[PDB]
Amino acid sequence: VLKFTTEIHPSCVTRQKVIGAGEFGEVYKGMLKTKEVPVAIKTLKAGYTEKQRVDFLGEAGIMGQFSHHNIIRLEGVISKYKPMMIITEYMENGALDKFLREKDGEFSVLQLVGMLRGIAAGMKYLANMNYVHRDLAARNILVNSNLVCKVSDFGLSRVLEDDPEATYTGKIPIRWTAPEAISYRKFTSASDVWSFGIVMWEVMTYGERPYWELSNHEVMKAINDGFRLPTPMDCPSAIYQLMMQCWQQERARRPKFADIVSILDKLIRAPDSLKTLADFD
Numbered sequence: 401v402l403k404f405t406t407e408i409h410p411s412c413v414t415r416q417k418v419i420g421a422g423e424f425g426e427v428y429k430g431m432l433k434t435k436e437v438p439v440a441i442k443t444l445k446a447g448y449t450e451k452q453r454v455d456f457l458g459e460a461g462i463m464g465q466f467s468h469h470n471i472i473r474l475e476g477v478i479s480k481y482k483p484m485m486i487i488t489e490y491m492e493n494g495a496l497d498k499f500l501r502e503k504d505g506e507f508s509v510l511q512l513v514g515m516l517r518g519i520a521a522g523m524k525y526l527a528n529m530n531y532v533h534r535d536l537a538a539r540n541i542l543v544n545s546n547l548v549c550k551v552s553d554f555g556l557s558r559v560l561e562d563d564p565e566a567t568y569t570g571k572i573p574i575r576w577t578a579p580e581a582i583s584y585r586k587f588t589s590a591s592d593v594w595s596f597g598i599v600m601w602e603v604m605t606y607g608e609r610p611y612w613e614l615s616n617h618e619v620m621k622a623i624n625d626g627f628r629l630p631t632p633m634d635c636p637s638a639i640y641q642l643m644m645q646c647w648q649q650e651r652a653r654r655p656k657f658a659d660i661v662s663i664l665d666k667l668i669r670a671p672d673s674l675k676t677l678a679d680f681d
């Protein structure tokens with residue numbers, strides 16, 4: 401059983417400005433009538449492979465199945481006319497990774513942790529709806545003008561970076577991915593929890609690149625030898641301990657998203673926890 405997605409009448413949508421472009425089409429900021437709200441509008445290039453068309457509409461189908469504060473809201477689709485569009489709420493501050501790198505140092509630790517609680521709540525909902533994201537990273541999170549972070553990208557065709565089965569005919573990066581997903585292709589909500597740990601580190605570093613200039617095989621060897629990302633400056637000790645739990649080599653030892661939300665709620669309501677920093681050993 402699945403939800404239909406609203407079909408939006410074309411006279412109801414006006415594209416205003418391009419905000420991005422990819423191997424499929426573009427994303428615009430626009431306006432939608434209801435009495436007139438800003439939206440984001442993703443088009444499919446007239447000149448698409450049918451594979452792209454099925455992937456394009458399939459992405460709208462997946463998005464329409466979700467209804468949660470921390471998951472990008474789908475307003476509807478224009479599927480019967482050209483150009484074909486997917487229409488969502490407009491997130492004023494855009495992608496989280498680029499946003500933090502433009503806004504370095506400007507937020508309180510309590511604000512950063514509230515951002516991470518939002519993401520974790522969105523991921524708990526996805527996981528309990530039996531949806532494995534496989535591609536959780538700050539680049540796939542969007543931020544609105546209330547600082548609310550929403551999980552946003554649900555594109556269908558994804559391949560692991562450096563997958564040996566790949567040939568010359570989007571890529572999921574190794575250094576966001578759990579070991580069991582790399583070593584034997586086991587993607588689950590528990591490998592999403594690993595990636596969430598990496599997202600935690602990205603947020604607490606204002607968008608630093610995980611493992612810096614280490615190569616993919618240097619990262620994998622470091623991880624397998626038991627090394628992990630270091631504590632970001634000003635990161636509360638309890639937050640670093642939480643990322644380290646997400647990075648347990650054994651799946652079973654990682655927290656569930658339900659545990660993460662609860663832990664983050666505890667700290668937010670007792671916010672002097674967020675000034676106790678990590679010590680040495």
Ligand SMILES: Cc1cccc(Cl)c1NC(=O)c1cnc(Nc2cccc(C(=O)N[C@H]3CCNC3)c2)s1
Pocket residue numbers: 419420427440441442472486487488489490491492493494495498542552553554
């Ligand atoms: C997430 C999503 C999936 C399918 C279809 C659609 Cl329409 C969407 N929604 C969006 O892409 C967006 C919703 N809100 C957005 N706001 C926004 C505003 C300004 C900048 C950005 C942004 O991240 N831009 C960078 C993307 C890459 N380089 C430019 C995003 S994009």
